[PDB]
Ligand binder design. Structure first.
Ligand SMILES: Cc1cnc(C(=O)O)c[n+]1O
Lengths: 289, 55, 206, 338, 231
């Protein structure tokens, strides 16, 4: 229903109507639940496990800040008025926050695998200084992996509204799509492998008769919430790639239905930040106390 | 047991011959000692940083 | 800084030396050892007036085994020295109630509410021979059941395990024949179970 | 004859109680009420001695108010330099179970002891350049919980076998042994004139010993639990006993009974170290409740809280010049307050 | 007991090289920062080099830097390259341990003779020879270009006594304290710039050469050397 040429390349964009009635009630609820949970989690909060969780809460803190700014974009029928620097920085640090959240989920799962399957390994005894430099290094690579979003040219004066969107639906294959694909494919495998090994190791020791069952349930539901939160976005994006490769941008009538499905399922990525206090509150007996 | 009991009896008797002074006199002596050394106590008066070595 | 620079060099030299010794001593696993007198405390790891320190290496772990039964004083005044032991190894002589009272006292101490107690029931075969001639009613007047070695052993094990109330600690009951050399493996696997439980606690997930 | 002996002992105890109560014309509070309050005492952590890797169980300032020796179960007895945080020596102990430490008034010798039943005397000023054991004093049947140097030659040690003994480091034999306690003699404090001392035992009593004749001159009671620490008043005519019943009393030697008690409703943990100030007005008593209350020794009221430790404080020491107080808790950090 | 014996002397042609080795035994050599002090045949002691505990820092004199090299099985080695005509001297191996209350330069090695064929703290002794009689009292004075009283209250003026035919021995360290093993007759004094080593009831065994030294900052500069000869 529309067309656009950006960076000397044609690109399709669609502005559906169901987004305005569906995006900002759930996103506000995620923002409200996320701020209520993650806000108190960081206030309450040192070991290797503690420091990794602390930085993970930090990443969710900025992501929760993103939602009210993003919600204004949806409510204004995708009419951005903030300007160049706000849109560019917002997209860059939002991508960095997701990437950091995913990579810190991976780090936490790897730490658990080393602490349940290989209890006598030296990595379980790393000092807080070693943990701090590692956490900073993981923060650094996230900055580098999303720095290209800061150099993009936006907004684009398209009709009476300005676009603040980086997930444009077209054949243009920027590196951002590659990062968004890998950051689901590889960390999901790491999470599943670590969780399966932890379950198998706890079952083999014959000490699952006990608290250990609650531990098993929490370890499983972490992977469950991760996969249910990230599967819809990646499957819709794969559908977008398949449609673009098979049909191209000759006709944009069929790209309207998939475009609206992408964002609503993309809202599940924020929902990850809303269910992260479960890793804090639901687990451990200290949090209820 | 008889020898052990005898030792305790003698020990208590020995302590019974110690002269005791009035409690008011001891309290006054303690007060006088505390007041006569008030200027030499660098804990109750915060010592200036000019000559305090823990700065 | 005239020669205080050289003083800093000496301080840094021993500060690094302290750190090097600290990490080396962190690999060792400490196991406080208790029990009644002549209850088999020295016949568990037989293959490998103050305090008695025993150390052996098994599967790349340095097991340090303090036998503090040599102190003829009150336990409460020095029991806080062993606040950070990985586990408590308890030896019970089945061939002879004092051990049960000592276990009750030590398993609910304020400093040992989170340290699990590995329990060893020694003299299994001597206990069986005694049961074959004398019944457990003599030592346990409340015992009502079959006069068999297995039932009596299970009853004594249940009585010992029943003296705890903190759910954060577990008792790894095990029975030895005073001749088996595999007790080291049992100690190792109990210790590693305790270690992974403590690691799960430290991750805020246990 | 045993019944007659018991009756005589009861009569003597009743006579002692009557004599002690007859002299209490006025308590300390109604006499000190005429003195102005000391006011709030604020103290800040000037120094923090990092370097220990286990719980610290003792800390004794040197006679020069600069050298602080700390004993921990890591197996080391590090002699610090409080002015510049530096470490002078790091003495590797023979055994890792240490519950006390001492520093010679001359600074030459450093003592150590614990569950080993042995009180080791180290030689700091050796010509070989290193610190070496000079005499491993042994002969006690229980843990040595407190040792102090009368001088470079003779040491007094308090053990957990109801016995305090005065050794002779030159020959390594008990010159005089003091007996009469019922429970473990868990604390000790030599008088400023070093001619006598007191030992707070686990039987809720602080007996006044005498170094020369080896006879207990006086005995003090009034505690409801064990005595974990004890220290003389600066004048030497009084001392304060830190009990495990969340209270600490100031006894007077000549009066021969308790003068004031320092109790607070908001306090339930047991005292582990009580130390006076240079003028005797303050009583910086540590607690197992993670803090260290400062009590006016006369008004018997709090004057500040030195809450800077993440674990129970196992020692407290005020320097000779009174310009610093150091608390060493189980979190391996000894902080020099001021 | 404590001994610092050494060897490696002999005649050396100019432009050659020679290794001087300090053999240490009887003390914890791993925690001592051994120095190197040379003495010309008819001049006072002059500093050469210094190596700390663990070889953390190495210092050389102004006229020695680059040409020599000092490195440390309980043995200290000094490399000599490109020897000049002024290197003919007897080299002493001096131990020194540094902490609060320590006694630097307490022991001096026997020494081996070796012969060949501006901002530094310069310190001068007003007198060079003082003829005194036994049983009297003598006083040796020492000055400095810059005040040696540091901020932390310590003044660094070490006094050394060199009996004829014997290596120097430490007498007064930090200008007020007394070295161990020294009779109480000696006593130091002075503050800031002027120093004085007062000897009371001088004995027949107190004759020799007294050297004044500082330790405020490397390179360490000895004094000219005052001789207290009999009668
Ligand atoms: C318009 C828009 C909204 N959300 C995101 C996101 O990555 O969450 C990206 N873009 O471009």
């Amino acid at each position: 229903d529309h067309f656009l040429e950006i960076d000397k390349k044609n690109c399709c964009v669609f502005r559906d109507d169901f987004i305005v009635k569906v995006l900002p009630p759930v996103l506000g609820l995620e923002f409200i639940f996320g701020l209520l949970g993650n806000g108190l989690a960081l206030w309450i909060f040192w070991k290797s496990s503690r420091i990794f969780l602390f930085n993970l809460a930090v990443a969710d803190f900025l992501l929760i800040i993103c939602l009210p700014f993003l919600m204004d974009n949806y409510v204004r029928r995708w009419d951005w008025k903030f300007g160049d620097i706000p849109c560019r920085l917002m997209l860059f640090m939002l991508a960095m926050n997701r990437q950091g959240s995913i990579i810190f989920l991976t780090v936490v799962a790897v730490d658990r695998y080393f602490r349940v399957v290989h209890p006598h390994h030296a990595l379980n005894k790393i000092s807080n200084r070693t943990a701090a430099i590692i956490s900073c290094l993981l923060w650094g690579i996230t900055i580098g992996l999303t720095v290209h979003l800061l150099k993009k040219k936006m907004p684009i004066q398209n009709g009476g509204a300005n676009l603040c969107s980086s997930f444009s639906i077209c054949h243009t294959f920027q590196w951002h799509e590659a990062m968004f694909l890998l950051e689901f494919f590889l960390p999901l495998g790491i999470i599943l492998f670590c969780s399966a090994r932890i379950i198998w190791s706890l079952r083999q020791r014959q000490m699952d008769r006990h608290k250990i069952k609650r531990a098993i349930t929490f370890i499983m539901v972490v992977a469950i919430v991760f996969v249910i939160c990230f599967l819809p976005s990646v499957v819709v994006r794969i559908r977008i790639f398949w449609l673009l490769h098979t049909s191209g941008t000759q006709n944009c009538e069929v790209y309207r239905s998939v475009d609206l499905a992408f964002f609503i399922t993309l809202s599940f990525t924020y929902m990850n930040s809303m269910l992260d206090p479960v890793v804090y509150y639901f687990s451990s007996p200290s949090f209820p106390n | 047991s008889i020898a052990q009991a005898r030792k305790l009896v003698e020990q208590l008797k020995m302590e019974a011959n110690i002269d005791r002074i009035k409690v008011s006199k001891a309290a006054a002596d303690l007060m006088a000692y505390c007041e006569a050394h008030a200027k030499e106590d660098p804990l109750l008066t915060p010592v200036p940083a000019s000559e305090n070595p823990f700065r | 800084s005239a020669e205080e620079r050289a003083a800093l060099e000496r301080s840094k030299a021993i500060e690094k030396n302290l750190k090097e010794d600290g990490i080396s001593a962190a690999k060792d696993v400490k196991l406080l050892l208790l029990g009644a007198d002549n209850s088999g405390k020295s016949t568990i790891v037989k293959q490998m007036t103050g305090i008695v320190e025993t150390h052996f290496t098994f599967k790349n772990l340095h097991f340090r085994l303090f036998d503090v039964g040599g102190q003829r004083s009150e336990r409460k005044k020095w029991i806080h020295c062993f606040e950070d032991v990985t586990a408590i190894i308890f030896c019970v002589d089945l061939s002879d109630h004092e051990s049960l009272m000592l276990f009750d006292s030590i398993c609910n101490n304020k400093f040992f509410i989170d340290t699990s107690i590995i329990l060893f029931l020694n003299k299994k075969d001597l206990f069986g021979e005694k049961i074959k001639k004398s019944p457990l009613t003599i030592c346990f007047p409340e015992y009502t059941g079959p006069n068999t070695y297995e039932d009596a052993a299970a009853y004594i094990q249940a009585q010992f395990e029943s003296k705890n109330r903190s759910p954060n600690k577990e008792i790894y009951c095990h029975m030895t024949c005073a001749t088996d050399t595999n007790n080291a493996q049992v100690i190792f696997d109990a210790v590693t179970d305790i270690i992974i439980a403590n690691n799960l606690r430290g991750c805020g997930l246990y | 004859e045993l019944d007659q002996l018991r009756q005589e002992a009861e009569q003597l105890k009743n006579q002692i109680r009557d004599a002690r109560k007859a002299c209490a014309d006025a308590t300390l509070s109604q006499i000190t009420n005429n003195i102005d309050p000391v006011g709030r005492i604020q103290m800040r952590t000037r120094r923090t001695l990092r370097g220990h890797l286990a719980k610290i169980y003792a800390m004794h300032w040197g006679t020069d108010s600069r050298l602080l020796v700390s004993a921990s179960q890591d197996g080391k007895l590090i002699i610090w330099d409080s002015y510049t945080t530096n470490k002078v020596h790091a003495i590797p102990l023979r055994s890792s179970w240490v519950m006390t430490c001492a520093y010679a008034p001359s600074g030459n010798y450093v003592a150590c002891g614990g569950l080993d039943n042995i009180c080791s005397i180290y030689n700091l000023k050796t010509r070989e350049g290193n610190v070496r054991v000079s005499r491993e004093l042994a002969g006690h049947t229980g843990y040595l919980s407190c040792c102090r140097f009368l001088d470079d030659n003779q040491i007094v040690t308090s053990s957990g076998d109801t016995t305090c003994a005065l050794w002779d480091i030159e020959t390594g034999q008990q010159t005089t042994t003091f007996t009469g306690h019922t429970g473990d003699v868990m604390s000790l404090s030599l008088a400023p004139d070093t001619r006598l001392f007191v030992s707070g035992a686990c039987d809720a009593s602080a007996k006044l010993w005498d170094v020369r004749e080896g006879m207990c001159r006086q005995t003090f009671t009034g505690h409801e639990s064990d005595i974990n620490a004890i220290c003389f008043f600066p004048n030497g005519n009084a001392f304060a006993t830190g009990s495990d019943d969340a209270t600490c009393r100031l006894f007077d030697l000549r009066a021969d009974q308790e003068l004031m008690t320092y109790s607070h409703d908001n306090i339930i943990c047991g005292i582990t170290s009580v130390s006076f100030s240079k003028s005797g007005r303050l009583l910086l008593a540590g607690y197992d409740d993670f803090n260290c209350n400062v009590w006016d020794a006369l008004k018997a009221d709090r004057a500040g809280v030195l809450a800077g430790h993440d674990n129970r404080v196992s020692c407290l020491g005020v320097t000779d010049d009174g310009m610093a107080v150091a608390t060493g808790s189980w979190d391996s950090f000894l902080k020099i307050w001021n | 007991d404590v001994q610092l014996v050494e060897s490696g002397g002999g005649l050396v042609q100019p432009g050659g090289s020679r290794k001087l080795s300090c053999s240490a035994s009887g003390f914890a050599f791993s925690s001592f920062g051994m120095h190197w002090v040379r003495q010309a045949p008819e001049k006072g002691l002059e500093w050469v080099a210094y190596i700390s505990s663990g070889s953390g820092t190495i210092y050389y004199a102004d006229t020695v830097k680059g040409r020599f090299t000092i490195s440390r099985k309980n043995t200290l080695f000094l490399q000599m390259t490109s020897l000049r005509s002024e290197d003919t001297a007897m080299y002493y191996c001096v131990r020194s341990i540094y902490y609060y209350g320590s006694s630097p330069f307490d022991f001096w090695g026997q020494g081996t003779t070796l012969t060949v064929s501006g901002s530094d703290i310069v310190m001068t002794q007003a007198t060079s020879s003082v003829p005194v009689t036994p049983g009297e009292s003598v006083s040796i004075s020492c000055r400095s270009s810059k005040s040696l009283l540091h901020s932390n209250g310590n003044t660094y003026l070490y006094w050394f006594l060199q009996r004829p035919g014997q290596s120097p021995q430490l007498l007064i360290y930090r200008m007020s304290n007394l070295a161990s093993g020294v009779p109480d007759r000696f006593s130091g004094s002075g503050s800031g710039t002027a120093f004085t080593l007062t000897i009371s009831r001088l004995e027949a065994e107190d004759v020799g050469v007294y050297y004044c030294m500082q330790h405020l900052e490397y390179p360490l500069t000895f004094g000219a050397g005052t001789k207290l000869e009999l009668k």
